[PDB]
Design a binder for this molecule. Structure first.
Ligand SMILES: COc1ccc(Nc2ncc3c(n2)n([C@H]2CC[C@H](O)CC2)c(=O)n3C)c(C)c1
Length: 804
């Protein structure tokens, strides 16, 4: 009766937040009640009308390539009733002015054209102009906001050295315990136990005294415990808790098993108590509670040394000379905004006096607050290397400036950045909540980004579940209903995917698939649901006739659905692929960097025609993918030079379209050539590369003799070259222009890649350093990328054959 709402959330989240079996403290519960106020703050402040209609707008300028589509400075928009009427409108006109009570909704979508923004600033308009599609809208009644209703003694006095006694270990299946006092990634001090023979139970009952004092312990200090037989098991314990108190008492911590990573810094313990290793520890308990409280100019040559350090990439290491120089001239380093990540690495966190000096420094935020928002720099202070709550907070405040559109660009990476946070109720977690509760699109993707990690990562499911419950308790009854219609479908369809995969090592499989879905369609399944990757799109009834099982090494479910919106322009079905086997969380990350790459090029007035298809990971190596209409594989066309160009002319009806297809190929090919090379996912097979009948080429399957990228003689013949051509010159020109544009955002791409490698996947990250050629000049870099084209031209088909 009363607890029916919590059980409703538990089914949506995929984890029971009310469960307190895998906890040793009230951390998750304190953060649950602490997340009430920021949720209430956004629910009360948000506009009912604007939130219900969720307008997707951008304050960014209109691109140079998109102005070419608007003739005589007036675009055409058609308003529907049975009857339609075309209206010529200026790009600077507001929807109300075109309206001359009634809303302008997109035909066949849940996207609305409202607010004090011009038509050129609407994301749907910029999309229609790109693909060369007519802007079709319908005079609708505004959606009711009532559908979105919401249901309702000092530590610095302790001069004694820190110690912790390791009682023993226990496993049902030579060894020693490695104790570490960690702050981020840096180890303050290390102490190891005597090596005793490895058995079922190994007791020590000995105190491990550290060099660090109680006074010198910082906020967010971790007690890293490691088992070496070499490394086998790991576990962590936050020494200074969420209530600013030094931990006390007996603890039995279940350790995570191995075989660097975001999964190592986790405060959460192993839920598998009947199969994992455990550790018994005791912390010095006291009667009184121990709580934690709250110039001259640089010379010419030394300034040249300091400015050189700030100028280097985020991966370049800081020596003792570098760290001491940055800390001594911290006030001059404070003047430079790019110096902040390198400066906050130069500070001794295991020293009470030094940490206090970092706080009085940070107080003079006069230059940081006034500085231009650098997302690369902002994200830099949110990684594994930064664990001070106050240092991480100065980055989160800069993210507040970021508009809704740009929040969507980095939403996935910001969600993964929570893994690097020492405590649960953090500024970043509170930020993701507020931005998710303000905008329906941000909140929708937030739900799926959180639900993806909960379903797989047991290391962070407890943390992400309390963030999802906090979002879910303010998204409104309308979204809560939609999220259930989505969950019910994705869960029922995940069952069929794993069932069909188990039945295959044909006529039998396709007849059994059509059997399994038919009885599901005429049962408890919803009549309509929202597409997790395209929330504007709404899929209805299953097209059982068009449903099939794909023929590959894995057995995915090719599913087709009729559109729920009857105001849709075409009767075209929605295609969704349910695939098990590959890690879709990796595909999710690469596709996001690809979307960022498109925005990076947009600011530089470039359009490299990338196709970043929809992909949402739902469970254990299982999720959904977008079916790209009128698109096939390169290997499918082969099942050698003329073969690809002939397919383009065959699928082209008029010469007007084939001359457009060759241009659509030149941009899309060069775009994926640059993108895949930078991220180190360029040496791929024809089966993992696709092309549309419109000429748009795109890379697929990012589930983890050599060549930098794919530029085979079948593609070069489309351009008209054999081992120059007017199209090939256009290709190399845009290849240089696109590569040069990404080098202007090196630190962004370095920090995006570094995070991806830690949350999704040391020497491996070092790849982008050479790929984006750090240290070299713009003219020197031009020759490097042109030489990579020459490697592809010399190799040709040699690499493609080698893939067995
Ligand atoms: C994460 O990888 C994926 C999976 C499916 C799609 N969508 C998709 N739409 C239409 C397709 C298609 N795939 N394929 C594949 C099947 C998988 C195989 O590996 C390659 C060929 C086709 O033959 N047609 C006609 C994408 C864009 C990426």
């Amino acid at each position: 009766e009363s607890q029916a709402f919590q059980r409703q959330l538990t089914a949506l989240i995929g984890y029971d937040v009310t469960d307190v079996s895998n906890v040793h403290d009230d951390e998750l519960e304190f953060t649950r009640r602490g997340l009430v106020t920021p949720r209430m703050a956004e629910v009360a402040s948000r506009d009912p009308k604007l939130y219900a209609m969720h307008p997707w707008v951008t304050s960014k300028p209109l691109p140079e390539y998109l102005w070419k589509k608007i003739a005589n400075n007036c675009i055409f928009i058609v308003i529907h009733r049975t009857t339609s009427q075309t209206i010529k409108v200026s790009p600077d006109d507001t929807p109300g002015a075109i309206l001359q009570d009634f809303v302008l909704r997109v035909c066949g979508r849940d996207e609305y054209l409202v607010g004090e923004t011009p038509i050129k600033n609407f994301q749907w308009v910029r999309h229609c102009l790109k693909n060369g599609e007519e802007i079709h809208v319908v005079l609708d009644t505004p959606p009711d906001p009532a559908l979105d209703e919401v249901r309702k003694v000092s530590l610095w006095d302790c001069d004694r050295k820190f110690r912790v006694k390791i009682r023993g270990i226990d496993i049902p299946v030579t060894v020693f315990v490695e104790a570490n006092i960690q702050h981020g990634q840096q180890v303050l001090c290390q102490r190891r136990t005597s090596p005793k023979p490895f058995t079922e139970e190994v007791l020590w009952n000995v105190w491990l005294e550290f060099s660090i004092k109680i006074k010198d312990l910082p906020k967010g200090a971790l007690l890293n415990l490691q088992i070496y037989c070499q490394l086998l098991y790991y576990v962590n314990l936050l020494l200074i808790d969420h209530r600013f108190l030094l931990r006390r008492g007996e603890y039995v911590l279940h350790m995570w098993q191995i075989s660097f990573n975001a999964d190592k810094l986790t405060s959460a313990t192993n839920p598998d108590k009947e199969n994992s290793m455990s550790i018994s520890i005791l912390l010095d308990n006291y009667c009184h509670p121990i709580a934690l409280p709250k110039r001259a100019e640089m010379p010419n040559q030394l300034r040249k040394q300091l400015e050189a350090i700030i100028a280097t990439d985020p991966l370049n290491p800081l020596t003792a000379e570098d760290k001491e120089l940055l800390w001594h001239f911290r006030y001059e380093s404070l003047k430079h905004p790019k110096a902040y990540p390198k400066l906050f690495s130069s500070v001794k966190w295991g020293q009470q006096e030094i940490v206090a000096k970092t706080y009085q420094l940070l107080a003079r935020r006069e230059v940081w607050d006034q500085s231009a928002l650098d997302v690369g720099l902002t994200m830099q202070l949110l990684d594994c290397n930064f664990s001070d709550e106050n240092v991480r907070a100065i980055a989160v405040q800069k993210l507040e400036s970021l508009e809704d559109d740009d929040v969507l660009h980095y939403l996935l990476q910001l969600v993964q950045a929570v893994k690097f946070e020492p405590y649960h109720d953090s500024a970043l977690a509170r930020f993701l909540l507020k931005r998710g509760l303000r905008n329906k699109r941000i909140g929708h993707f937030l739900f799926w980004f959180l639900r993806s990690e909960i379903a797989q990562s047991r290391h962070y499911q407890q943390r992400f579940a309390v963030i999802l419950e906090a979002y879910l308790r303010g998204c409104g009854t309308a979204m809560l209903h939609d999220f259930t219609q989505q969950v019910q479908v994705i869960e029922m369809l995940q069952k069929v995917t794993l069932d069909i995969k188990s039945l295959s090592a044909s006529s039998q499989v396709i007849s059994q698939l059509k059997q399994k879905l038919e009885n599901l369609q005429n049962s408890q399944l919803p009549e309509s649901f929202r597409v997790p990757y395209d929330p504007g799109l709404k899929a209805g009834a299953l097209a059982i006739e068009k449903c099939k099982v794909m023929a590959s090494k894995k057995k995915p479910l090719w599913l087709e659905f009729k559109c729920a919106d009857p105001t849709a322009l075409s009767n075209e079905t929605i295609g969704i692929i349910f695939k098990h086997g590959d890690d879709l969380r990796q595909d999710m990350l690469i596709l996001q960097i690809l979307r960022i790459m498109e925005s990076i090029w947009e600011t530089e007035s470039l359009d490299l025609c990338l196709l970043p298809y929809g992909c949402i990971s739902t469970g254990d190596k299982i999720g959904m993918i977008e079916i790209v209409k009128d698109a096939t594989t390169i290997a499918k066309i082969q099942q050698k030079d003329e073969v690809l160009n002939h397919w383009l002319k065959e699928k082209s009806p008029t010469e007007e379209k084939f001359q457009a297809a060759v241009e659509r190929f030149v941009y899309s090919c060069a775009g994926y050539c640059v993108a895949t090379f930078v991220l180190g996912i360029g040496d791929r097979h024809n089966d993992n590369i696709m092309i549309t009948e419109t000429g748009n080429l795109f890379h697929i399957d990012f589930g983890h003799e050599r060549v930098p990228f794919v530029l085979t003689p079948d593609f070069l013949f489309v351009m008209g070259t054999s081992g120059t051509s007017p199209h090939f010159q256009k290709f190399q020109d845009i290849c240089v222009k696109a590569y040069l544009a990404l080098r202007h955002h090196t630190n962004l791409l370095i920090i995006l890649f570094s995070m991806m490698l830690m949350t999704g996947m040391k020497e491996d990250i070092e790849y982008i350093r050479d790929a984006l050629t750090v240290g070299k000049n713009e003219e020197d870099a031009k020759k490097y990328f042109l030489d990579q084209i020459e490697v592809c031209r010399d190799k040709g088909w040699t690499v493609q054959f080698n893939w067995f």
